[PDB]
């Protein structure tokens, strides 16, 4: 846990971004 600002990205982020794009 070096970076205080490090978070996670997964398949669900992808799908929400693609939905957000299509709309």
């Amino acid at each position, epitope marked *: 846990e070096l970076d205080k600002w490090a978070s996670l990205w997964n398949w*669900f982020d992808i799908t929400n971004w693609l939905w957000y794009i299509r709309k």
Partner: antibody
Amino acid sequence: QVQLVQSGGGLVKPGGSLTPSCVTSGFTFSNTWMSWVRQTPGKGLEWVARISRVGDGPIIDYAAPVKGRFIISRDDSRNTLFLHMNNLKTEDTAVYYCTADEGAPILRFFEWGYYNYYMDVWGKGTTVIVSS
Amino acid sequence: DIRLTQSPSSLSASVGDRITITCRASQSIKDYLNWYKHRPGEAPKLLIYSASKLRSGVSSRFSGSGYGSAFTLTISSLQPEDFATYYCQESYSSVPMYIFGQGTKVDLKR
């Protein structure tokens, strides 16, 4: 090495409670959706519940036969998935599997946003016997 | 409210055989279909996701085909470890239900 280490479950009276658990290693637990699936005697595989990352809500869904009696929860700092079983019934007797789930995004444009949800890794199961 | 029908319920096979099992959905589910294996005494395991995508680590002897309502799982050359029960599973419902088929048990022919 990916492992889903499950509790021993055990034996409970109808109306009682139990909390099978699943402690994971080998992958980033906090980035992973999780489910419980059960196998009742004689019958086949039956999905029970799923939970997302804590940051997604969490989003939680339950199968109709357990809605209102079971609670799925997670503790990321310990890599632990729980299934809190309350008001247990003889129909709940089964082997309960924890699973690490994934979603396959649909890349066909008009289905952008939809995904195929599947159980990517499974534990060996915990037996729960509900009997008077 | 989607239904899955697997056939045959029981398949007699020998070591080295080409094996085919089928899953019929009550309606078009496109490619929202996955295949699992379960041997007694082992954790279930994913074989195929999205109708035809092979899971990493699973042998190339497994392959899935189909789009809509008629899906197939094929084992090109049956090995002893393949004697097991195989399930299909759909993920197409709006309210998640994730129905599994009843399973096809593959056993040793005599």
